[PDB]
Write a protein that binds this ligand. Sequence first.
Ligand SMILES: Nc1ncnc2c1ncn2[C@@H]1O[C@H](COP(=O)(O)OP(=O)(O)OP(=O)(O)O)[C@@H](O)[C@H]1O
Ligand SMILES: [Mg+2]
Length: 382
Amino acid sequence: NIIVGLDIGTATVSALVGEVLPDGQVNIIGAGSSPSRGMDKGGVNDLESVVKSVQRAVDQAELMAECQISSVFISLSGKHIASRIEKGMGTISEEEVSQDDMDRAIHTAKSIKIGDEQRILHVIPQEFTIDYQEGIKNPLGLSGVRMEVSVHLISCHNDMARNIIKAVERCGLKVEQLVFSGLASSNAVITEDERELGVCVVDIGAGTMDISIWTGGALRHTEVFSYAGNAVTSDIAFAFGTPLSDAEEIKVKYGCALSELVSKDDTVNVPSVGGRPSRSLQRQTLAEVIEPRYTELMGLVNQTIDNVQAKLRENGVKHHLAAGVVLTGGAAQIEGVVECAERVFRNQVRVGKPLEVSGLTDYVKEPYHSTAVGLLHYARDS
Ligand SMILES: Nc1ncnc2c1ncn2[C@@H]1O[C@H](COP(=O)(O)OP(=O)(O)OP(=O)(O)O)[C@@H](O)[C@H]1O
Ligand SMILES: [Mg+2]
């Protein structure tokens, strides 16, 4: 069957077509990419711009798969993404847990007073409890009288999700499911082995950075900040008086996250606006602009872990990340992220990349594809 994932980002839009296989693997058949215009902080700013930009990437990806695209799996992120842990319970009719006995138990967990500005997009039943038998992941067929569930809720702003959905429908597609950007990137960068000990995946992009914490194989918290790779590009464009279109080229090419990792002999050529000569600038001086901003972006991540570990260690649940912090997304490709993050996070830090991709491994390499390939891992589960 044909499977499609769509990552509408603040900088680039990525579309991926894939095939389902018996063992549970994703054979990617087609890939598409296009720059995104009219998009800020994870949400849209110009609807007509993203409709063309998301049709540009979805048209070159169906050509590269020889099949028309109908249903897609889109991703969305933003500061409105909130995570809630809720508990539900219910009786067990006939002393044998069926599917109805769980939906009624999950229904009680997600029936909360949320409002209307918010809408829930993920409901993740984690651990069940059938009559003093705690720690049960899938209680189908088990015998008992009463069950208890702890369900993880992830909600988002409704109006900021309606704008993203309309851009996909305006192209002639139908959305099958909306996936959180940090949850998809997590589900395609770390392995189940990395989930048992503990991990903290961050998806630093252009508009937003997406945080996900797994301590034991279950999502423990979800938090999103609207400061990312575009807030540091402006820092370059401001401190040196150059356009953002030019300050972005001297960041992708000559960017460094730690000023003590570039020699004093490295010089970069920053242009000038209007038609004036381009003066040479020390790459170390440019790295001295990128470093203080990247450490603040990780201070928000490090203080989020501290507040979550204080709610997990003080609650009788696994709380330590023995595998450290994993950095994915386009902004995690700048020189020195590993050494800049290890200086703020006491734990180890690595940079994740989409793994175990079958075919088309010439465009599914760098970590700015982790979200798009995480939607494929989410659409495989059907
Ligand atoms: N080699 C590089 N060095 C430094 N920064 C880079 C590099 N390559 C890309 N970036 C940064 O990556 C950012 C966008 O990358 P990415 O594809 O992860 O974003 P996105 O998915 O569109 O955004 P979002 O997080 O809003 O979904 C840009 O701000 C750019 O500055
Ligand atoms: Mg992204």
